[PDB]
């Protein structure tokens, strides 16, 4: 059976927070594949369906537990079951379409959105944008409950839908990226709770063509310079992966290590 | 499109193919399902050839490998070590996990792989005689089929199933003021270049 | 893995009866498919998606059902609808196929005609001796034969024809193959018949 990571929104702490998401890197990829000191997730190629997603648990306070569906390929969301139902994310493909069939494999319902889990489709169908839309263990706590209770009749799916973005975010890149790992770790230890600056938005919508960019590099350095943002909006471009080391921390798999 | 027919001996095996035409070959599944003899479908494994990821149900896996030749847009399935539990037919089919094409499924011809030592024997042909039933036994064959007709013809009659060596039976009934005009059984083995026609005589 | 029962194994309908079929899973299933199959076919989707009627599907033809429960239905059974109906489910892995439901045209009760026929002259000079026994044009499929050679049985050879597609009938052919050695050591050849449509078992027979 896939591995199963649990964190609660129940008092959680710095420590709680970031031994989660350290522990949902250390199953997303080996390490032993490693470019310029930054780790690469599995190639989806050749990949056993049985090492193809981990299954993250979350609980609240409300004592609510949903579990989500995680591809070791992108890191991304596919799905989640709660209780005797499983939903997933519209696959883009035939291979994807097959492959969640694999997951929660023991559920009595099974249903399939219209619609895909890229932030794009999700903003639209929530009303809000994600520098709209708060992180924090609060917004957690209530993506957690609103999940839940979606199979129930209980949730409408503007408030699904933004409740992914809240999962996708503070699950998904926070293992993707350790500076939006930090961002939330912020936000639990003053107790916070806003939408993401900047900074953070720009970096998940750049993190696929940073893992182009980092792996098709020369010796470090970028062919084409990337653009980003910092926290107050000011654009500035990268030309080389050292500034990024203490900042992304997983990528997808482009190419095979040069020599 | 698949063959129709493998002859393999006891403990060999067995390679089979299934070419496809008509859509994209790297974006849809390929499936096997094995048919016995007048049972059931059972479900032997599945490829996916744009990407090379199987799957083979737990009945099957260390019995069978899928690979997939890009080149000839073709799927192969290999069993190993055949018995006779494993002479059946093997379809393989395309179809479609989700929604969007969900009407999309489409089966190969199949492959009827029997499973013998035999040799090409010539066949056997022997009269049945006594409102009047008359009859052939095709007695002692390999491989099948054999045809049997009257001329024509044409009604009345009962071909039977081949029956294990192969044997078949078949009945032509006919008014009882007709046992005076001729009655023929018209055999062919196709794989022994024989026709037999046997008068039915008392 | 997800088993799924299909019930009944064999049913019977006149053409034009009201005709369903269930599947029983041992676990829930969302969406439900359904195939049909003619003996020397490939099967042919019929139902996708539990209930939306496959391209070309005369209409009454409906599918539905949740959870563990499933059914396959027509409205009034036209005869091109005798065949074998197998539910399937792709959505759980593995994917599954039902046990399988055939339908056939049922009909007037009929006996079936017994003909015993003793080896040919041509076998005999072979040092073989089958025995044939046809059982031609009966209905329902189910019957029994017992040999009875003086009395006694043994070891013999029967098969049985698909459902005429003129009179909706069935057929059985039973051989048996003994050695003219030891054919000749005995007088009396019986082929008894039990069925439904008698009571009193149909008997053919000869001597040698």
């Known amino acids: 059976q896939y591995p199963i990571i649990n964190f609660t929104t129940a008092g959680a702490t710095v420590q709680s927070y970031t031994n989660f998401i350290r522990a949902v890197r250390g199953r997303l990829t080996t390490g032993a594949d490693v470019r310029h000191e930054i780790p690469v997730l599995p190639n989806r190629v050749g990949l056993p369906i049985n090492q193809r997603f981990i299954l993250v648990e979350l609980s609240n306070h409300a004592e609510l537990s949903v579990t989500l569906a995680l591809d070791v390929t992108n890191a991304y969301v596919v799905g989640y079951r709660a209780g005797n139902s499983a939903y997933f994310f519209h696959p883009d493909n035939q291979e994807d379409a097959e492959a969640i069939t694999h997951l929660f494999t023991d559920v009595q319902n099974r249903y399939t959105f219209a619609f895909g889990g890229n932030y794009d489709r999700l903003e639209q169908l929530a009303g809000n944008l994600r520098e709209n839309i708060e992180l924090g263990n609060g917004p957690l706590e209530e993506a957690i409950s609103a999940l839940y209770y979606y199979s129930t009749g209980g949730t409408q799916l503007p408030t699904l839908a933004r409740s992914f973005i809240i999962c996708i975010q503070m699950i998904s890149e926070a293992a993707r990226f350790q500076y939006i790992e930090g961002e939330m770790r912020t936000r639990i230890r003053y107790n916070r709770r806003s939408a993401p600056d900047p900074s953070v938005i720009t970096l998940e919508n750049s993190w696929g063509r940073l893992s182009t960019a980092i792996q098709e590099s020369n010796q470090g350095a970028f062919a084409s310079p990337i653009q980003l943002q910092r926290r107050n909006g000011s654009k500035f471009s990268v030309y080389d992966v050292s500034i990024l080391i203490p900042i992304i921390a997983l990528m997808v798999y482009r190419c095979a290590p040069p020599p | 499109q698949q063959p129709g027919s493998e002859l393999v001996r006891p403990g060999a095996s067995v390679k089979l193919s299934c070419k496809a035409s008509?859509?994209?070959?790297?974006?849809?599944?390929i499936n096997w399902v094995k048919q016995r003899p007048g049972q059931g479908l059972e479900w032997i494994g599945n490829?996916?050839?744009?990407?090379?990821?199987?799957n083979y149900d737990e009945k099957f896996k260390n019995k069978a490998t899928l690979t997939v030749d890009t080149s000839s847009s073709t799927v192969y399935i290999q069993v190993s070590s055949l018995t006779s539990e494993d002479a059946a037919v093997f379809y393989c089919?395309?179809?479609?996990?989700?929604?969007?094409?969900?009407?999309?499924?489409?089966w190969g011809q199949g492959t009827s792989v029997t499973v013998s030592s035999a040799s090409t024997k010539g066949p056997s042909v022997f009269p049945l005689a006594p409102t009047a039933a008359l009859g052939c036994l095709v007695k002692d064959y390999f491989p099948e089929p054999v045809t049997v007709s009257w001329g024509s013809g044409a009604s009345g009659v009962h071909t039977f199933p081949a029956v294990l060596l192969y044997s078949l039976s078949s009945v032509v009934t006919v008014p009882s003021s007709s046992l005076g005009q001729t009655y023929i059984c018209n055999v062919n083995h196709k794989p022994s270049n024989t026709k037999v026609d046997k008068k039915v005589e008392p | 893995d997800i088993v799924l029962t299909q019930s009944p194994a064999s049913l019977a309908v006149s053409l034009g009866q009201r005709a369903t079929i269930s599947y029983r899973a041992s676990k829930s299933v969302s969406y439900m498919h359904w195939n049909q199959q003619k003996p020397g076919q490939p099967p042919r989707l019929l139902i996708y998606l539990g209930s939306n009627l496959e391209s070309g599907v005369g209409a009454r033809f409906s599918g539905s059902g949740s959870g563990t429960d499933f059914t396959l239905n027509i409205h009034p059974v036209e005869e091109e609808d005798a065949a074998t109906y197998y539910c399937q489910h792709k959505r759980e892995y593995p994917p599954t196929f039902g046990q399988g439901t055939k339908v056939e045209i049922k009909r007037t009760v009929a006996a079936p005609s017994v003909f015993i026929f003793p080896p040919s002259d041509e076998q005999l000079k072979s040092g073989t001796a089958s025995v044939v026994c046809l059982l031609n044009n009966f209905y329902p499929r189910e019957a029994k034969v017992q040999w009875k050679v003086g009395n006694l049985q043994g070891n013999s050879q029967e098969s049985v024809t698909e459902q005429d597609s003129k009179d909706s009938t069935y057929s059985l052919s039973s051989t048996l193959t003994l050695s003219k050695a030891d054919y000749e050591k005995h007088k009396v050849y019986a082929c008894e018949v039990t069925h439904q449509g008698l009571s009193s078992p149909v008997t053919k027979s000869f001597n040698r």
């Open positions: 490829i996916y050839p744009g990407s090379g990821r199987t």
């Open positions: 089919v395309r179809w479609v996990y989700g929604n969007f094409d969900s009407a999309l499924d489409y």
């Open positions: 008509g859509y994209t070959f790297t974006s849809y599944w």
